[PDB]
Each structure stands twice: as C-alpha cells, then as structure tokens.
C-alpha cells in the first residue's frame, strides 16, 4: 500500500529531453548457461536478437557471460547509478526481447509511487494567489474603523 | 404484514406516496383575482 511503501515526485535525470535526449540505460550484463533448460530462451535471444539490439543502441555496452547457472539474469545499470536485476528464467525469446526493450526505455529512477502525474518548476506565470490578490486598496491604507489625523 | 383493509390508515409504499403527491388536484388560477375587477 501507499502508506506502507516510499514515494517520490515525478522527475527526470539531468533535465533529460530538454536540450537533448540521452538514453539512461548504460550497461546490460547477461548471464546465460551453455547447458540448462532454464536458459533455452536466453540462448536463442543471444543468437539472433542481441546482435540486432546492440546495433540500435550503440550507447549501451552489453556484456554476455556464458557460465553454469541455474537462473539466468540480466543486470541493467543506468547513468544515475541505479542497478536493476531481472531474472530471465524459463522466459521465451519474445518475452526476453520485451523485457530488454523496457529496460532500455526506463530512466532508472525507483519504480515507486509517484505523488503527482506531473512536475513543473514554474507553476505560475501571472503570480501565485495570496489573500490580497483580489482585495481592493483604500485611500491612505486605512484599516477598518481607524481614525485618521486624530 | 397487515391486511388490505385496516382500522388505521395503512402506510403506503413510497412509490405510491409519490404517485399521490404528483396527481393532486390543481385548481384553475385566474390571471387577475376576480375580486379586483368591476
């Protein structure tokens, strides 16, 4: 629940997209197994998909490591320093493709409750409301029931 | 429940109560009260 978990405000990394868009995904580390049914879908992803995926994303360094493992995993690292580990155990090639593409599109900020679905640093152009905004002024700034020149 | 004929005035179902309210006699009102004319 919201009260049982942390929250944050909607934000970006270094004002991304303002002057130019910079992909936040910086590194991908695959750990596949030469033998093992759990990694069957991950092995097929490395044969036809990983090479074409790297061509599109030249700013992401992909590290494929083939070693004995019972649970194949992809570890995504982002420019802001976030590290995310996602198991690809027994996933199909299409499933892995979808997951890897999602990681490429994310900023790396915590996937937690966002308080507001918007953010702005300049919420007011005409002046933020205050109690005197719509109050008229009086001659000599006299207060209610105030004797002047006594 | 109570029988269709009772010694007291039986409470009506609310929908019937509304029906009665909406179908009350409305007398014809003259534009000018007749006592205000010759």
């Amino acid at each position: 629940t919201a009260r049982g978990t942390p929250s944050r405000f909607l934000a970006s990394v270094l004002h991304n997209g303002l002057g130019r868009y910079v992909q936040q995904l910086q590194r991908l580390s695959f750990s596949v197994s030469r033998d093992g049914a759990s990694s069957r879908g991950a092995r097929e992803f490395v044969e036809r998909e990983v090479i074409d995926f790297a061509r599109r994303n030249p700013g992401v360094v992909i590290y494929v490591n083939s070693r004995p493992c019972c649970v194949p995993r992809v570890v995504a690292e982002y420019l802001n320093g976030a590290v995310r580990e996602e198991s690809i155990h027994c996933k199909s090639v299409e499933e892995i493709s979808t997951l890897v593409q999602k990681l490429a599109d994310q900023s790396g900020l915590d996937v937690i409750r966002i308080r507001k679905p918007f953010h702005t640093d300049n919420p007011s152009i005409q002046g933020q409301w205050h109690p005197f905004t719509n109050k008229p002024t009086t001659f000599r700034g006299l207060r209610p029931r105030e004797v002047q020149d006594p | 429940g109570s029988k269709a004929v009772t010694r007291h005035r039986r409470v009506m179902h609310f929908q019937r109560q509304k029906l009665m309210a909406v179908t009350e006699y409305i007398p014809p009102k003259p534009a000018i009260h007749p006592s205000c004319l010759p």
Partner: protein, 99 residues
C-alpha cells in the same frame, strides 16, 4: 481491501476539493459556483474542474477573465429570457456549430 476501495474515494474527494476551491475563487468575484460552471459551458468552454481549480491558484488574472466571461454570458441569458424574441442573440451567446 482498504487500499483497493480507496481508489474510488480518491477520485470523489479530489473533485470535492476542486469544487470547494472553485467556489472560493468565484465568490471573490461575486459569483456562485453553479453560475460559473453552467455559464462557461454555454460559451463552449470545456475546461474541467481540475484545471479551473489550478487556474484559480496559479493564474488568478486568467480566472477573473473566466469569471467575467461567465458573468457576461449570465447577463445575456437574463436579457434573452426577459425579451420576447425581438432581441438578436447575444454576442457571447452565439454557438459555433460543427458539422
């Protein structure tokens, strides 16, 4: 279960808040809430209550203009209702048609 059902109340409460805030802003200009919302619709201004509440806080000059526009349309309604059809439609009462 509470967290699940609270999603309904969040939307309900959010809208009660906007109406309260819009009512406050309208009263500062001598307008009641129903007059503003009703008459803005008659001007084909489809601004929702969320935006209207935000405008009241952060765009008070625009909101006074919206209040003025609603007030103008409201007065045109009265003149039309008072008239017997002789009068042409009010300048702000004309509706843009879409075919």
């Amino acid at each position: 279960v509470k967290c699940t059902k609270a999603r309904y109340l969040k939307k309900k409460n959010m809208r009660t808040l906007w109406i309260n805030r819009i009512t406050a802003a309208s009263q500062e200009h001598g307008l009641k809430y129903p007059a503003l919302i009703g008459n803005l619709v008659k001007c084909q201004v489809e601004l929702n209550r969320k935006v209207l509440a935000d405008l009241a806080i952060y765009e008070p000059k625009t909101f006074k203009s919206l209040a003025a526009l609603a007030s103008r349309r409201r007065h045109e309604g009265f003149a039309a209702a008072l008239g017997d059809g002789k009068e042409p439609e009010g300048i702000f009462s004309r509706v843009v048609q879409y075919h």
